[PDB]
């Protein structure tokens, strides 16, 4: 009654130890795609009409 009826309770390197580097990589890929598309839109709008 007083103890249990009212009771209230690897070696390799894990992806968590390096997840930050993956976040930086994918953020950098997104930034690269944004920069490329910005330059392409700039050039495509810079044609003499």
């Amino acid at each position: 009654k007083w103890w249990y009826d009212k009771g209230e309770c690897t070696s390799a390197l894990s992806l968590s130890n390096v997840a930050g580097v993956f976040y930086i990589l994918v953020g950098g890929l997104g930034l690269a795609m944004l920069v490329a598309l910005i330059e392409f839109c700039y050039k495509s709008r810079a044609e003499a009409k």
Partner: protein
Amino acid sequence: DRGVQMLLTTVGAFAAFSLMTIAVGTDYWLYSRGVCKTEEVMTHSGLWRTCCLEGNFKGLCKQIDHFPDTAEYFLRAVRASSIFPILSVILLFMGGLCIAASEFYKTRHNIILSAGIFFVSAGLSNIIGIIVYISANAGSYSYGWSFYFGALSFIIAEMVGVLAVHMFIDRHKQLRA
């Protein structure tokens, strides 16, 4: 060989979209060993419902309790609302829509580029989703066929994006002639 390229890219877009949607909706992402609806028995936990099996009352299951240092709070929020897997589904849908609209309003040869960009971005969102899922699970086990359906959707999405960009390059090459 244009023409067959369009069929292959459309089949690939539909396959990637279907696989990613099945992966998100289905719940066989992790074969853990935990408690079913509130003894430890196996479970086919998923993105939303930690569901039971080989138990006293197998087949009856509940909604995962995501929540019990802002970094942990942000990661738990991003993993609670599967924003990245769901964003992958939306981007694959919009990519497929652009590919379909590439027959109507043709000669633009600038929306198929948008299809390539959407498929590449869908893949990137999918990989971020996998990373957050695995990282949050670390707060014996195995991965189910829903996990691998998500991964295979990533691979097919990246291939279909490469095909779409190839077709855009070929179209501007024809136009420059």
